[PDB]
């Protein structure tokens, strides 16, 4: 039950010369014939391949200092910034990581950054040695992620990577780590490495490399950066990762005693290639394509060619001639990164199903046996023969100037078992969410300018995977924004938006908070005929609906009632709606960390915290409701805009609740009534489709009964703190009797009191957890007058009770915060290439 | 499999150059703290020798070993006597898949615009770039497993043990070196540390001590060799330990990349424990990072507290200690400097002890009594299991950790021993060799010295580590020894190079060797009766007792002399010892022969059967026995009656033998007694080599008619005609004019020395001609050498091991392993370097 357990890679990431920022934009290079070849820029200070952004770094994002970000070799910046966008690539947020196996492996070597003295303006004094010491370039990355498998920099030079991909699948096979990042960099600072190569007479005056080509006179030097993601095969199929590709084998050696260190043996390449083969029990025959070593020196590229043509080339037998190229030839030589550079031109390949490849320039080299054509330059893209197993695989080779040779199979990853695949909440409507945060605004904007480019320029893409990839593989910042969208192009348009600062239908902004969530249940009219209707698919809020139909009739005969109104139905089917909502937004993971409700809201919050079942909490308001259909004909009330105090004639009106600075409930005699409301026909008052006044003394006739009715029932602790609006405090649910419950209906409704309160202990987000936004208005009112950041949202609307609402609700509680588990909502879509995080970078170069 | 040491090498401050002196100077309780040398640029501990480097010893330029990272140097140098520790000749491996693990980084060697003078442009880069100082003992000593450097800081020398015990594992090759070297060439690490104030003004690590005040910067080469244990058992290897389980994590996100994480601590710890199945109740030892740091050394002891601390249930208090408290942090070496430390304590079968300085730190919870400091030596508790075990740490700055477990190597299966060829005496040749005649000198003090101070070690042992598990160089030396008195006297004579009997010295060359087979008077009564007892050699006598009973009645007559006994006894000694020095390693480039001495060349070369070669000196000798009575022959001391007297044989330019008849010499001997013409009659009635035996002719041309000349498998170089001949044309007619022309040897010997030959061995059981072949040497100003065989009145074991000493000595193969067998690897001096300093 243990063998060589197949390795695959689920995520790889690369800057490489040419402007190549991305896998996909070395696609772009490699087909489009265009090289890299430039001259050194002048901003390094001393022909080659040279990155665009080579000492730009977004040092901010991961909290360095702008002093130590200056100390910092630029490679260890690449290697952080590329370690990053793999971890994307492969679609893990990196957070889930912290405290994880996963292991590091940079290929590496030293370039000449930092070798003058230190500018005592430049302040990087206590930071050069940190960041400039091999360790380092990947203890920093493991400091940085808080990972917690081995951490290693290893230099073979034009191998490094290869290697640290080798050694990183022995690590994954052993145990040492259960998911590994592997790669290499470089940056050519300081100009040693070019010098020593001119002197010795091996570099191309083109800064080209032209590899089996007649024209080869030297190789060009170049840079980048390359990482790939490791995850042993049976753990990436388990999690349901993308597998790009495999390792299927992968051989490491030395040339021995060559006719000078660096000087190349195509014996041990020879030998190299087979342990290859045999790790992975394979034959030449079996891989259509090689991505060779190919640098563009005379004497090389010949030793190269002999021992593919001693390995590759023989028992070609049905599989026809082998293909070869080199990405080198388009990038230049990349150094420590050159080998997983070869290993992601490959895996381009693969996707796409065909060769990739590689510039050819001039006649093939009259250097090498071509004579039993049984090799073939990769001219231009050319189909991929799978093998005799239907599998199809290539080679790719790293022979460094120190001497270690590398060689790895690549194989198309094995078909996924399919798997029940979960459901998603909420009827499908064709519009999905699309969620965006980074760790600025600027940041954000370009996030979504990025997203709206690359969707209008890859169409066809389907939005439930750019929705669940871009929340499900994707890390949630602090500066958020949401996106809602039926087709490709209305994302496009609504990115944009965001991009360009325009407030449109369908888009949210917001920051994200630590407070807790408060969910705010407010009964009073949140009622509209045919409510929450659109949701009675969702087996979360169906299966509430029912059980209190089951409870409602025992204590009132009455049930959904909506098929196709009075207090005493009324408030036991707002009851029931509101429980229900709040049960969707838990299934959703909308957790509270407290409930406060208004008047009759205060019953659905106790049971939504747990302080009164659900039997109790309907027998609760059934018989609280009944009980004032028993005080109907005189008393009304009314609503009055304009602050208490203010509106504060008597012994038959009073004030009954207080909603907010600017409202006000007032209540008493019906006539009484009519005549302070046209009195002010002359103060924006309104009176309530009510036939009786309660928070008055109208209600003292029914106490004792009420009381007595619910005797009963049996308050518990609560699970989720309840803030009473009564007690104008926290208060345990075992003191929530009939005591209470009359002391509820009785006294005054102190709400605008109680959201001050919970505004003052630092609560981030308000939820209405209501069929129509009825308190909102009031709480955002009083917020803004205690000059708080807090969030008001509401669940759902009039015209609005559908799940498209419920759906525009998630986003928004997910943009201020509130953590919405995505995969209970958009159950578990693929996962698509998208742009990675938009680093901010700055240049540093000491 | 569990992956073994088999062999181990170290430099390090306190002036440590091997195992040995760490062992001494951790024993004795002293510490290297020190000024920075003064001659580095710019308080700490240094190496004795950081800049010292023998270029010439891996032809390596004095300009490359300029601009090469000392670091790089240390590390060639230091897997040299790893391997010599391990018993393996270098050059054995020259095609191997030997793996070399270099844990090692950046020091500040080389930062500066070189002066021109210097002449390190277009060196300096290779000589200081990290994949080239692991990718450099690949090349110079040939190896082609994986060659990789890698820094994980502190911990550097110990995740290189772990990589290549996986490499091991997985197949990716067959034999590793593994370890770390640092050399602080510049300032720069000592000031970050200092700023940090990380660094005791001592210089002094104080390594769970009260007094702990920060670490001590430190240096060092500390280099293992790995081998599976299976095939570390087959090559029959001395393991030292094995390496049951090593684990590699990270802290993660500690307070700080230098931060230290106990969690992270403990779970190294406990899957260490995981990959060699075992738990901290079976380890005995754990010796640990150290340092000395007041707020590291806590945090070490509490992961070692909830780990070896936990369940020891009644196998008492794990002991504790860190060598860094005699040495400081040798930062990548760091760990397998402690490896090698817990390895010197298996040996012993004791606690390797700790410099604990002050009271135990008030910081950390000693209140379980658990954990207890390695204060002097202390007895090795064994676990259940009966295996002793220690566990070893180091925990990197960039937060890299590994923890070994290492432990002591299992029993091995016993196996026959392969039997000596020639009969045991007590005398053992002892060789030493080295690429100049000052280095050879060296290595025979320092061995003289070693045998001084280890006196008791066996003379086999010491006689069979240096044939067999030293490489042979270019200027050698040879002693012979009954006892190691003995062996120290003839030793301090090659090192002071005076001469004395027991002791051989010589030049090793290319040239190939040529069997020399006399006749004349090479015998003696009971000659070579002593090698009898030797298989090879009496089943080559037993098998020529069979032939001549066939064509006579003699045998073996050399227990309690006539010319048709003597030539053919004189044949069967010779082509056994031929038979000899063969199974003994001598490989014969040609064979050459002088009269009846070519028969047994012929026999030698395979020009003619043991039968046919018998056969043909059976008659040619009865054939001389009838032609006798009157003739005679005499030696006559110079360079080259007339128609009685011719010369009869060329023996070298001051030697030549006269013959003719009986009678005429008598009066040239007067003539000579008179004159003061040395010379002296040998005692035969008969004048060979002249037409006195053309009468027996046309009769021994009929007798050996039947005999049937084949190719050789070895040049036969004919004196006769002076020219190499096919041994088809060896025919009577040949064996004929052999008796009857006259014997040009001189002029043969003159000939293959021209050739380019080396080595001439007379293959008989008394030099004869060795003395004449010389003379001819010195006048063509060769520096070709002569040997002997037997000798009259020893020709026993003794001379013959003798022989083959002095064969060896002037570069003939000897076996070794056929010539002694299987005894004892012990550990002696190493390669004696003779490095100069270079320092940029």
């Known amino acids: 039950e243990l063998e060589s357990e197949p390795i695959a890679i689920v995520g790889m990431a690369c800057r490489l010369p040419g402007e190549v920022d991305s896998p996909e934009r070395l696609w772009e290079l490699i087909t489009s014939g265009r090289d890299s070849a430039a001259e050194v820029p002048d901003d390094r200070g001393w022909h080659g391949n040279f990155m665009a952004g080579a000492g730009d770094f977004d040092a901010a994002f991961f909290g360095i200092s702008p002093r130590e970000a200056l100390a910092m070799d630029p490679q260890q910046r690449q290697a952080l910034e590329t370690t990053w966008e793999a971890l994307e690539s492969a679609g893990i947020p990196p957070e889930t990581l912290r405290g994880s196996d996963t292991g590091v492996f940079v290929g590496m070597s030293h370039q000449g950054y930092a070798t003058g003295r230190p500018r005592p303006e430049d302040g990087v004094d206590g930071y050069l040695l940190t960041g400039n010491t091999a360790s380092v370039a990947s203890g920093r990355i493991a400091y940085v992620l808080g990972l917690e498998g081995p951490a290693l920099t290893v230099d073979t030079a034009c191998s490094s990577s290869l290697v640290a991909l080798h050694t990183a699948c022995g690590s994954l096979r052993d145990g040492d780590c259960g998911l590994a990042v592997a790669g290499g960099v470089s940056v050519m600072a300081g100009p040693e490495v070019f010098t020593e190569f001119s002197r010795q007479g091996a570099l191309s005056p083109d800064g080209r490399c032209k590899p089996f080509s007649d024209e080869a006179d030297g190789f060009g030097l170049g840079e980048g950066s390359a990482f790939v993601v490791l995850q042993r095969l049976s753990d990436a199929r388990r999690e349901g990762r993308r597998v790009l590709g495999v390792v299927a084998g992968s051989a490491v050696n030395q040339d021995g005693a060559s006719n000078g260190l660096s000087a190349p043996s195509g014996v041990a390449q020879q030998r190299v290639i087979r342990r290859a083969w045999a790790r992975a029990g394979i034959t030449g025959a079996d891989v259509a394509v090689v991505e060779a070593h190919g640098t563009g020196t005379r004497l090389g590229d010949p030793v190269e060619a002999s021992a593919l043509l001693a390995t590759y080339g023989k028992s070609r037998g049905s599989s026809g001639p082998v293909l070869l190229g080199s990405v080198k030839s388009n990038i230049g030589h990349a150094q420590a990164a050159a080998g997983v550079a070869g290993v992601i031109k490959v895996l381009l390949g693969l996707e796409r199903g065909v060769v990739p490849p590689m510039l050819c320039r001039g006649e093939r080299s009259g250097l090498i046996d071509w004579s039993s054509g049984e090799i073939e330059l990769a001219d231009g893209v050319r189909e991929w023969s799978p093998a005799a197993d239907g599998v199809r695989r290539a080679g790719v080779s790293a022979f460094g100037v120190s001497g270690t040779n590398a060689h790895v199979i690549i194989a198309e990853p094995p078909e996924p078992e399919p798997v029940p695949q979960p459901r998603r909440m909420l009827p499908a409507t064709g519009v999905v969410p699309v969620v965006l945060s980074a760790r600025t605004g600027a940041a ?298 009359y002391r509820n209906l009785r006294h005054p409704v102190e709400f605008h009191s109680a959201v001050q309160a919970l505004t003052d202990q630092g609560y981030a987000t308000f939820i209405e957890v209501s069929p129509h936004p009825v308190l909102a208005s009031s709480v955002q009112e009083t917020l803004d007058d205690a000059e708080s950041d807090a969030a008001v949202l509401g669940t759902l609307e009039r015209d609005a009770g559908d799940a498209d609402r419920f759906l525009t609700a998630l986003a928004d509680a997910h943009t201020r915060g509130v953590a919405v588990d995505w995969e209970a909502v958009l159950g578990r879509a693929g996962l698509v290439d998208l742009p990675g995080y938009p680093f901010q970078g700055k240049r540093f170069w000491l």
């Open 444 to 741: 954000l904007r370009a996030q979504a300018g990025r997203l709206a480019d690359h969707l209008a320029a890859h169409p066809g893409i389907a939005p439930a995977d750019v929705s669940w990839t871009m929340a499900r593989a994707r890390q949630h910042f602090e500066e958020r924004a949401a996106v809602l969208a039926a087709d490709t192009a209305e994302a496009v348009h609504r990115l944009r938006a965001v991009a360009d600062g325009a407030v449109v239908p369908g888009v949210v902004t917001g920051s994200a908070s630590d407070g807790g969530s408060v969910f705010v249940f407010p009964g009073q009219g949140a009622q509209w005929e045919g409510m929450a209707r659109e949701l009675l698919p969702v087996p979360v809020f169906a299966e509430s609906i029912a059980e209190c139909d089951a409870v409602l009739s025992e204590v009132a005969g009455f049930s959904v009632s909506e098929v196709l109104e009075r207090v005493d139905v009324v408030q036991p089917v707002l009851f029931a709606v509101m429980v229900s909502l709040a049960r969707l937004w838990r299934a959703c993971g909308a957790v509270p960390s407290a409930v406060i409700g208004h008047s009759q809201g205060e019953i659905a919050a106790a049971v939504v915290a747990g302080a009164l079942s659900l039997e109790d909490g309907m027998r609760v308001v059934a018989r609280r409701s009944r009980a004032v259909r028993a005080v109907a004909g005189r008393g009304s009330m009314l609503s009055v805009r304009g602050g208490r105090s203010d509106v504060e004639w008597t012994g038959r009106l009073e004030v009954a609740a207080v909603n907010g600075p600017d409202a006000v409930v007032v209540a008493g005699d019906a006539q009484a009534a009519r005549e302070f409301l046209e009195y002010c026909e002359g103060i924006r008052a309104r009176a309530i489709p009510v036939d009786y006044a309660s928070h008055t003394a109208h209600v003292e006739p029914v106490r004792d009964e009420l009381v007595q009715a619910l005797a009963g029932i049996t308050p518990r602790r609560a699970e989720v703190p309840f803030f009473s609006t009564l007690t104008g405090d926290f208060l345990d649910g075992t003191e929530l009797d009939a005591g209470y419950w």
